[PDB]
A and B are shown apart, each in its own frame.
Chain A
Amino acid sequence: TTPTTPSLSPLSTSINNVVEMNNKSKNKNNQDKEQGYGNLNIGLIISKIEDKFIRILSSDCNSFSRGWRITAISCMQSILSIDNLCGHRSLMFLQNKGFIINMINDTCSKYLSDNWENIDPKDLHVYKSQMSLLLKISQQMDGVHLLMNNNVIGSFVKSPFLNYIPTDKIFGKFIEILLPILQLFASLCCYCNNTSKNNGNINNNNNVGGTVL
């Protein structure tokens, strides 16, 4: 769906008056059903096929020739924008197949090693799509955790490319390779803020140890 309109905030409304809380749940329980059902239908298709679909796609993301490798990686990017509706299961399945650490090692060794000046511009788009998939993972709470649980910052920081002082005749190709790393490293800082809502309503026993940073 297209975005909803922004909800203007009448900042001056500070005084006493009581009644118009109790009607505000009502009509949201419609539009949150109506956007809910289509996304839940997609989620209730993916979450029956998951173990086979993400398994085939994560195989193809490393088994495919150049151009279709990018198509499989961008299919994975589009699915991770929806995996929240399954419950981060595709993301968790990728770690439960080592795909994140294997794609980090596939990235550093082939595009951030000493031969970076010699990278084929066709496979620089395979690098950009691999980095855009790491950027799509760091856009999630559990995804920042899973990137640190594969030493992402330290495993890029050990790679020969970052020791290089650039000079003019190739400076644009250095920026094309440095920019996605700085986007990924900035993205890892983002989620580390949501610690402040610990209202102790004990009465509903529910252990899933999701790692609040």
Chain B
Amino acid sequence: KEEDESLIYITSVYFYLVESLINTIQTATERRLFSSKQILQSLENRESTFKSIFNRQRSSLNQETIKKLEQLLIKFEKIISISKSFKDFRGY
């Protein structure tokens, strides 16, 4: 929480770890954990945090490393969309 570049780094590792977990989730029970309020609210806090710091630094970062973070944001928005699709594939 002390440096933007470090918070961007560890939040990127966390979302790539969640990208591994989305390729190991099989059962209805696991889809019920990944759609839990606590996981979903962490993912949305992590996206909001990264998206805030990214737009704080979109004026100092270079035009490849900006795209590297814009390609990450579209993954994080998809990861939250999977935590939500696995939530509403529960009503059917």
User: Residues on A close to B: CB < 8 A?
Assistant: 202, 205-209
Contact = CB atoms under 8 A, between A and B. Distances in A.
Interface string B35-62: 1000000000000000000000000000
Contacts of B32: 206-208
Contacts, number: 19
A205 B29 contact: no
A185 B88 CA distance: 39
* Interface residues of chain A: helix, strand, loop or mixed (majority): loop
Interface string B2-45: 00000000000000000000000000110110010000000000
A208 B87 contact: no
A106 B20 CA distance: 42
Nearest to B27: A209
Nearest to A203: B91
A148 to B, nearest CB: 20
Interface string B53-92: 0000000000000000000000000000000000111110
A202 B91 contact: yes
Given A205-B35, A208-B29, 4 more contacts: A205-B87, A205-B90, A207-B28, A207-B90
